[PDB]
Amino acid sequence: FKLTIGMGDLEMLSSTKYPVVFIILLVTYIILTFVLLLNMLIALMGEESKHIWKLQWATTI
Amino acid sequence: VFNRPILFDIVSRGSTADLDGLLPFLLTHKKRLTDEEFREPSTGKTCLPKALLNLSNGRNDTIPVLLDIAERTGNMREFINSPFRDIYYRGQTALHIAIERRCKHYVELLVAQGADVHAQARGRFFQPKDEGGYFYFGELPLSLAACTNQPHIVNYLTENPHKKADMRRQDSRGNTVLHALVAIADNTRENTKFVTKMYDLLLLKCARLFPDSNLEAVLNNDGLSPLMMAAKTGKIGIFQHIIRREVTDEDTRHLSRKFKDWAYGPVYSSLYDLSSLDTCGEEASVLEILVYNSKIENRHEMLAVEPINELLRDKWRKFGAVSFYINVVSYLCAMVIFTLTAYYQPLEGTPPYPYRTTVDYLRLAGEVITLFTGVLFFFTNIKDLFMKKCPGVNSLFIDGSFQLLYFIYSVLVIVSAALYLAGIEAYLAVMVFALVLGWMNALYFTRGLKYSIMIQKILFKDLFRFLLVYLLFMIGYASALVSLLNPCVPTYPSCRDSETFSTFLLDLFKLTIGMGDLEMLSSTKYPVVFIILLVTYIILTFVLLLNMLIALMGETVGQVSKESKHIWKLQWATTILDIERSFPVFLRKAFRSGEMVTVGKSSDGTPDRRWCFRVDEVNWSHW
Amino acid sequence: KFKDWAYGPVYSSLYDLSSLDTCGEEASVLEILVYNSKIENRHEMLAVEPINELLRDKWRKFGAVSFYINVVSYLCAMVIFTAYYQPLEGTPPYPYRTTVDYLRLAGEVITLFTGVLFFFTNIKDLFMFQLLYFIYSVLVIVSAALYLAGIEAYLAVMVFALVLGWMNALYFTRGLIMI
Amino acid sequence: SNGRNDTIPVLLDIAERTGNMREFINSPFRDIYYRGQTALHIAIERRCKHYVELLVAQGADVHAQARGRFFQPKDEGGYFYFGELPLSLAACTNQPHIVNYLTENPHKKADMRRQDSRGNTVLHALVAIADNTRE
Ligand SMILES: N#Cc1ccc(O[C@H]2CN(S(=O)(=O)c3ccc(Cl)cn3)C[C@@]2(O)CN)cc1F
């Protein structure tokens, strides 16, 4: 979990018996996590052009 | 007096003046116009085709005199017949030319003596463009008239006292006139207009005469019906017109495939036929060809016709959704068992052969379930080779790449089991990779949804391609950088060893994240180029990551794209048909979509027993 | 634009190629259109009947085969470029006696042949993009000269000689979203 | 068929002779899908002016409720909803002549203010059926 932010220290890769495949399985982990986190943001925080500026503003009145 | 060049020139001139008088010379010398030493040795063509090709102003008086000469010489049966021994015109006859020049007078005149209306144009010029030709129209004079917009010529060839060409006649490939009409039609308005017009004309005319099964039901050498070949070749217009065929004539009612069950209020039902659209095994079906073997450029628009889309929806609602949910839950449970086995697998020393424990027996059960799944996937992938398979499936998004990933998972699980049984310790390393690939393959079951929008917008193939590019780039660049390190004494830090590549890649992975150390910079003996190489590596890594980021942004900003939706429908249909094909014949009969109905009557009062699919519509426009 | 033959649903035509494409003994239109031309409108011209089909026919005849042989040979040469497996210990002029030692040796020879091949190919143009291919080559010859001379500082330039080789290989997807 | 059939006048002619006129034209379909559809509903929905004219000339019934399952909106699991009154059916199916005649007729007229089984009057049915298409 700390690897996602980068706070945690990555000394665990020195313990695996197969660093050649652990590193491959960790790079894909980072890419998958970043894509999966970016998708929900672009799906929710993003969202036709003035539909929101009309409806959400008329709601306040 | 007259030689082959002389006669050919005088007949090409289109003047029946100098030729007159050859009769005594030809008859006293005992010669015939079809003699080997009298026609062209290369082509074999006679003078009559020379006159026909050199036709001017639509008429030439030399041909009547030429046929008169032929009848005096006693060669008329063989005169109007010319199996060109060229490697390009193997069978082109005088009638082929006469129809090819759009002349009604000559197409009447040549058949007025009754020569032939069934010549096979088997030459390499009259072959389909796929097989190295220029124009394919079947191999019949009637097919030639039908394929080049000659309604009057077809009508004359049908009802003529001399000799008529039966519409059921088949070419060298077994294709009939309907098959040729399908084969000529490209998806354009002006073409498809008269193609469909003359298709219906020929179907009605062949239904009137010879009151038996319609000509549309005849099969060529490989069994393809005209509708079947229309779907296979990728022709939207003819296919769509065949589906929505309605004939109001009382005699010819069995030719229709869309009925008018009940018009009740402003909701209008329809009764589409389903004889060739869905069959329970014991027949070829148009849907399986449309999904599996068809011209990919317009495979999506063909699926959006009135019966096919609702047929797929009905199959879904009936059994497809239930079977797909069962499959996905079974797959998820299997890979949950796989994850539990991988995590609880012992790792000490030799592979953990000594189970002798109920917990270890449960672990063995999980392992054997995993091996069963792997061998099942491998056998299903291999068995396809003896079935519908072998497309250009290397990056296709039509389940031709997910099958490749399943093949990889299966073969790698098998090799993991082999290494586990052979004492190789790397069985765990390969097994974890197999587990990861299986969990990513679990995205296969995202085809049952269109949340859903952002799931569909992201494509796994784009992500996997970038992932595989990035991993190879990192490994290849680390291999280059580790070369610069001076050999021996430490191994990874401040030195190089034969094993140091396994640990050096960790430094690059940490440094591209932002947690790396510049310790290896002093390791190399030549830092001046090492720093430049490291900077270039970081710049290219950032370029790759951000290029993938803009790829995602552009792919997800649109929401619904023109093509990103047709592809989803294609995968959904492929999944539905793959589920259907896994059921037995009787089970498919039980789940046969549509309802049995007697659409109408036929000869001898026999009811028309056709499976049909209702598609109701509402329209407040026509009363 | 000739009109050789025509029959209903076919209308053959015969386009001239006197100036559009000239092999050797004349100037050509397509070379000027692609190389020395106004860049802002270089795609409007390529939407004509003969030139597009001319390029497609050239591809179908030989372009696909030549490009697919070239890309595979270049990738194979890059993969062989043995840099990881160069002799760690010993003097840079390491003799070859072991059957496995000489195995790599070959690879070095074929890489040197590729380097001199591109060097001569680019020089033939200079004596009668391509800028990278020139520096793509001369570094290989320099490393080979350093290897045969005895200077230990050959590996540092040898690796960078064909690390740029991968960027050269990147030109195959763009003409030798976007990159 | 063909917009005219001569069997209906003869059937009605036999009907008055049989002495069952008030009961003969009454068909409360007991099917689960047609709970309420009568002769007037069928005649109106077929958009035939002459037959409905003749039918209401004797005034059998003009207040039947089409409470069956078929005559329900798509939400409830039906195919066509127009309310439950024959007047609502005539107004929904674009029959100004049928509504006009059914309102100002000598024999008997239907109450236009009447609510259906769901409380909707004819105007609510007209609003419910009117999708956002120009035609
Ligand atoms: N329920 C269910 C279901 C059945 C078949 C299927 O996939 C078909 C595509 N392939 S597959 O990717 O290799 C593949 C995927 C999943 C599985 Cl369990 C085995 N094989 C071959 C295939 O036609 C099967 N003969 C997908 C499903 F969801």
Residue numbers in the entry:
A (entry chain A): 674 to 720, 728 to 741
B (entry chain B): 148 to 597, 602 to 639, 654 to 788
C (entry chain C): 405 to 485, 488 to 534, 549 to 596, 604 to 606
D (entry chain A): 203 to 337
The authors write:
Another preclinical candidate TRPV4 inhibitor, GSK3527497 (antagonist 1, A1), is a pyrrolidine diol derivative and backup molecule for the clinical lead compound GSK279. In the case of compound A1, the aromatic residues F524 of the transmembrane segment S2, Y553 of S3, Y591, and F592 of S4 play crucial roles in sequestering the antagonist within the pocket through ring–ring stacking interactions. Furthermore, the polar residues N474 of S1, T527 of S2, and D743 of the TRP helix, along with the nonpolar residues I744 of the TRP helix, also contribute to the binding of compound A1. Specifically, the Y591A and I744A mutations reduced the potency of compound A1 by a factor of 6‐fold, as indicated by the IC50 values. The D743A and Y553A each caused about a 5‐fold decrease in potency. Moreover, F592A also resulted in a 3.5‐fold reduction in the potency of A1 compared to that in hTRPV4 wild‐type (hTRPV4WT). However, the hTRPV4A1 and hTRPV4A2 structures adopt a C2‐symmetric configuration rather than C4 in the hTRPV4GSK279 structures. From this overall structural comparison, it was observed that the ankyrin repeats domain (ARD) of the two opposing subunits of hTRPV4A1 (without A1 bound, referred to as A and C chains) exhibited an upward orientation, whereas the remaining two subunits (with A1 bound, designated as B and D chains) displayed a downwards orientation. The binding of A1 and A2 to the VSLD pocket induces a local conformational change in the TRP helix and S4‐S5 linker.
Transient Receptor Potential Cation Channel Subfamily V Member 4 (TRPV4) is a ubiquitously expressed, nonselective, Ca2+‐permeable cation channel that belongs to the TRP family. TRPV4 is widely expressed across different tissues, such as the skin, vascular tissue, nervous system, lungs, kidneys, and bones, and contributes to diverse functions. This polymodal protein can be activated not only by environmental stimuli, including temperature, hypoosmotic conditions, and mechanical stress, but also by endogenous agonists such as anandamide and arachidonic acid. TRPV4 is involved in various physiological processes, such as osmoregulation, inflammation, nociception, and temperature sensation, and plays a vital role in human health. Dysfunction of the TRPV4 channel is implicated in various diseases, including skeletal dysplasias; neuromuscular disorders, such as Charcot‐Marie‐Tooth disease; cardiovascular diseases like hypertension; and respiratory disorders, including pulmonary edema, osteoarthritis, and renal disorders.
